[PDB]
Amino acid sequence: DELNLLVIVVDANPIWWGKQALKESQFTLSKCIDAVMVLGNSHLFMNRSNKLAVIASHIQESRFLYDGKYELLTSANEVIVEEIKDLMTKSDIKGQHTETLLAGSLAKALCYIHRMNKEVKDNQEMKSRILVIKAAEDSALQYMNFMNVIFAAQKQNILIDACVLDSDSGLLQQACDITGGLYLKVPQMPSLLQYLLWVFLPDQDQRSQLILPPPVHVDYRAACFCHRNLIEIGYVCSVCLSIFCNFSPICTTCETAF
């Protein structure tokens, strides 16, 4: 009667993966996709009722990615491979946008989890969690939307786990701390699959049994309204609670509201 749903958000930003490929390093996007597929197969093998979802984030949008081995896994892997090929090959850079649409992917994941929860029979509880692997730099323009997504996830009691590869993201740290998830930065990229299977594979009930690395130093720097930049000291309106970097005689937000 225990159902676990795992949604894996893959940072498929073409710029960062192209730079990684040009670096000629031992880790590429192909290995990341293979590790994600292996993690999904392991999650499906953990229990029959386990449900898997994979969402790939791109500059354009979010794509729902979902002989001798399991039949369902063979079908599942082929669909994911076809989707990732279709997304990347047909991805054409049209504009100067470079930040990853991480907030939209999380919103789609929340909508999918909400859809799946209703279809579950009332006798069983669907424990759901979201795992995010971060490759590109964080986007400060989507701060409010990201916070709204975090609050929505916390309201429905959905764990959010972040697997940072290259650069730490404050938004992911806040999401992990607020929702009670696990935040981890990968020291060695080629060993990504072992980290995923050792840390993020167990469910919340099993995480109590096991011993896990302590949470990293989570920051809580706020985003200014007129700059959308993280700040430590700033001016905050007492009515609308808006945050400003510099003092102003009149609040812009309160002036907007009539």
Site for other proteins in 127-156 (CB under 8 A): 142-145, 147-152, 155-156
Residue 163 exposed, middle or buried by CB count within 10 Å (0-12, 13-18, 19+): buried
Q: Considering only CA atoms, give the Rg of the chain.
A: 20
By three-state DSSP, how is residue 224 classified? coil
Q: Binder to other proteins among 51, 56, 100, 108 (CB under 8 A)?
A: 108
210 is an interface residue for other proteins by CB under 8 A: no
Tokens, residue 57 = 């984030």
Nearest to 130 by CA among 147, 148, 105, 165: 105
CA distance 161 to 129: 8
Strands 62-64 and 51-57: antiparallel
**Binding segment toward Zn ion, per CB under 5 A, in 49-57, 73-81, 141-149, 232-240:** 232-240
Member of 110, 136, 162, 182 binding other proteins (CB under 8 A): 110
Query: Which residue of 144, 212, 226, 236 would you call a contact of Zn ion, by CB under 5 A?
Result: 226
- In the complex, minimum distance from the CB of residue 114 to other proteins, in angstroms, rounded to a whole number: 5
In the list 47, 70, 125, 206, the residue contacting other proteins (rule: CB under 8 A) is 125
Q: Are 13 and 58 in contact (CB under 8 A)?
A: yes
Nearer to other proteins, 56 or 131 (CB): 56
Where would I find the beta strands (DSSP E) of 49-142?
51-57, 62-64, 125-134
Q: Whose Cβ is closer to Zn ion: residue 140's or residue 201's?
A: 140
Q: Does 1 bind other proteins (CB under 8 A)?
A: yes
- Tell me if 231 contacts Zn ion by CB under 5 A: no
**Residue 176 within binding range of other proteins, rule CB under 8 A:** no
Site residues (CB under 8 A) for other proteins, limited to 43-62: 61-62
Site for other proteins in 84-103 (CB under 8 A): 84-85, 88-89, 91, 93, 98, 101, 103
Mask for 9-38, x = binds other proteins (CB under 8 A): -----xx-xxx-xx-----xxxx-xxx-xx
Residue in this structure with the two tokens 């279709």, named with its chain if needed: 86
Question: How many C-beta neighbours within 10 Å does residue 184 have?
Answer: 20
Q: Distance between CA 218 and CA 89 in Å, rounded?
A: 37
